[PDB]
Amino acid sequence: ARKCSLTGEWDNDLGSIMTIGAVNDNGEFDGTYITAVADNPGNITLSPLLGIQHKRASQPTFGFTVHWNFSESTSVFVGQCFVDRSGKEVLKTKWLQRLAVDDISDDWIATRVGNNDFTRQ
Amino acid sequence: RKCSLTGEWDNDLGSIMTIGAVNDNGEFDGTYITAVADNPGNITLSPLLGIQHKRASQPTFGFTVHWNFSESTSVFVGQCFVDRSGKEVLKTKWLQRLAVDDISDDWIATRVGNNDFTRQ
Amino acid sequence: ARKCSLTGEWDNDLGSIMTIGAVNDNGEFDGTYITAVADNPGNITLSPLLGIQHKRASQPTFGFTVHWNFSESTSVFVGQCFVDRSGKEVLKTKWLQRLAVDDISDDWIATRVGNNDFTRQHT
Amino acid sequence: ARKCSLTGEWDNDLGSIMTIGAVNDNGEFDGTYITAVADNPGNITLSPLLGIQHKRASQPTFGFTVHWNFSESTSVFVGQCFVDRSGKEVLKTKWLQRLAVDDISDDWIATRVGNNDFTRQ
Ligand SMILES: O=C(O)CCCC[C@@H]1SC[C@@H]2NC(=O)N[C@@H]21
Ligand SMILES: O=C(O)CCCC[C@@H]1SC[C@@H]2NC(=O)N[C@@H]21
Ligand SMILES: O=C(O)CCCC[C@@H]1SC[C@@H]2NC(=O)N[C@@H]21
Ligand SMILES: O=C(O)CCCC[C@@H]1SC[C@@H]2NC(=O)N[C@@H]21
C-alpha cells in the first residue's frame, strides 16, 4: 500500500472514527463514519461516506461527503494528506455541515464550518 | 420527483453541472464544467461524486469534484428547495482545497464560497 | 466622499441594514447594525460594530465585528468594495457567526459561515 | 485581572503573536498582530487590529479585524474564550482572510478560511 492512499481506518481530534474502502483507478472511494459528536449525540449511528482523492501526488488533495443516517444533515470534508519523513500520515481537513431548514428564507442559518486532523487508528 | 438532483444545472458563475441517476441510498455521480479556475485556459470537464437525502421534498446533499486539470479538489454542501410554483434551487456553500508542498503551509490552502444552482 | 468609503448606509441581501460613521485616518470605523434575521428574531435590537478598511485602494478590502446586544453571539464580516463604471458600489462579503457554548468540548458546533452582498441605500 | 479579558499578550498555534490593549466599557479593544505566516513572509510587518468582546459572560465570545499593513488583505477572527478548572484560558477562533482582486467577477477566489487557538504568553 502506498502512503496517502485513504484506504484504512482513521480517527480525528474529536474522537470520530472513519473507515475508507478500496480506492479505484479514478480515486473514488466509499467508507463509514462514526462521529463522536452531533446536534443530538444520543441519536448517533454509523453513516456512509463517498469521496474522491487525487493519486499522482504523494501528498494528494481529497474530499468526501457524509450522509448522516440519523439526521437530515449532510457534511463534506476537504483536505490534503501529508506524510512526514518517518512516514506518519496526517489528513488536514476543513469541513462544512449543512442542516436542513424548511424555508429557503432560513438558508443563512444552516451551514457550520470547522476543521479536523485525522491520523491512522 | 422535484429535488432529485439528476439532470442539468447551472450556477451564478456560469458553471454547468450534470448529475446522473440517484441510487436507492442517495448516491450519484456527475460531471462539472467550471466557468472559472486558477488557470482557466486549462479547464476541462471533471467528475463528481456525492450523496443526497431521498425522502425529504427539500433534501440536503453534498458532493466532491475532482478537478482533472489541477491538483485541487472542491466540495459543495447544500439543500434543494422547491417553491410553491415547482421551481428548484440548490443553495450551496463550498470549500476548495489547494495542494501545498508542506504541512506547515496548510493554513493557506482552503478557500470558501457559495453558489446557487437552478435547472439548465 | 470617495467611492468605497464605508461611511454611510448599506442594505444587504437578507434585509439587514448598517450605518457607518466617519472612517479615521487609519481606516477605522464604527457603526450600528440592524439585522433582519437571528436565532431568536423577537429579541432583535440594534447592535454596535467596529472595523477597519484599506483607504487608498480604488476597490478596498475591509472587515468588521458586530457585538450582538441581544444574544451572546458575535459576528465578523470581511470583504471587498467594488465600483462599476457607472459608480455603483457593491460590498462582497463573507461572514462567520460565533455562538456561545458552555464547554470547550462543544467548540466544534459553534461557528456558522455565510455570505452577504451590501449596496448603498438609495438617496 | 478577570479571566477572559482579552487585554494582554497571546500566541497561536502557527506562532503568531498579538498584543491587545485595554478593553473599554463597551468591550472594544485594539492591538497589534504579528503574523508568523503570510503569502510572502519576507514582507511581514506589524499590523493593527480592532475588535469587540462580550464583557459579562465568564467565557465570552469576541471578534476582531486585522488590517495587514504589508498587503491589500484583511483578516477577521471570531471565537470564544474558555477557562478550565486550573484557570488556563484558551481562545478558540476561526478566521477568514480576504484577498484583493481586480474585479467583482474574480470575487469567488478571494476568501480563505481557517482556525487558530491562542493561549497567553
Ligand atoms: O449532527 C448531526 O446531525 C450529524 C453529525 C455531524 C458531525 C460533525 S461533521 C464535522 C465534525 N467532525 C466530526 O468528526 N463530527 C462533526
Ligand atoms: O481552480 C481550480 O484549480 C479548479 C476549479 C475550481 C472552481 C471553483 S469550485 C467553487 C467555485 N464554484 C464554481 O462553479 N467554480 C469555482
Ligand atoms: O442570531 C443572533 O444571535 C445575532 C444575529 C446574527 C445575524 C447574522 S450575522 C450574519 C448574517 N448576516 C446578517 O445580516 N444577519 C445574519
Ligand atoms: O498574507 C497576508 O497578506 C497577510 C497575512 C495573513 C495571515 C493569516 S490571518 C489567518 C492566519 N492566522 C495567522 O496567525 N496568520 C494567518
Author numbering:
A (entry chain D), D (entry chain C): 1 to 121
B (entry chain B): 2 to 121
C (entry chain A): 1 to 123
From the primary publication:
In order to characterize the proteins encoded by the AVRs, avidin related proteins (AVRs) have recently been produced in insect cells using a baculovirus expression system and have been demonstrated to be functional biotin-binding proteins like chicken avidin. Interestingly, the biotin-binding affinities of AVRs have been reported to vary over a wide range of values, AVR4 being almost as efficient a biotin binder as avidin and AVR2 showing the lowest affinity for biotin. Each monomer in the homotetrameric protein has a β-barrel fold of eight β-strands with one end of the barrel adapted to bind D-biotin.
The X-ray structure of AVR2-b in complex with D-biotin was determined at 1.4 Å resolution. In AVR2, the O10B atom of D-biotin forms an additional hydrogen bond to the NE2 atom of Gln-97. Leucine in avidin (Leu-99) and AVR4 (Leu-97) is replaced by glutamine in AVR2 (Gln-97), and threonine in avidin (Thr-77) and AVR4 (Thr-75) is replaced by Ser-75 in AVR2. The side-chain atoms of Gln-97 of AVR2 not only interact with the valeryl segment of D-biotin, as in the case of the corresponding Leu in avidin and AVR4, but also with the carboxylate group of D-biotin (see above). The presence of the polar head group of Gln-97 in AVR2 also affects the type and conformation of the neighbouring residues, such as Ser-73, Leu-99 and Arg-112 as well as Ile-109 from another subunit. Ile-109 is found close to the biotin-binding site in AVR2, whereas all other proteins in avidin family have lysine at the equivalent position. However, this substitution enlarges the binding cavity around bound biotin and hence contributes to the lower affinity of AVR2 for biotin. In AVR2, only valine (Val-113 in the AVRs) is conserved, while Met-96 and Ile-117 of avidin are respectively substituted by the hydrophilic residues Lys-94 and Asn-115 in AVR2. In the crystal structure of AVR2, the side chain of Lys-94 can exist in two alternate rotamers, which are hydrogen bonded either to the side-chain oxygen atom of Asn-115 or to the main-chain oxygen of Val-113, both from a neighbouring subunit. The conformation of the L3,4 loop of AVR2 was found to strongly resemble that of AVR4.
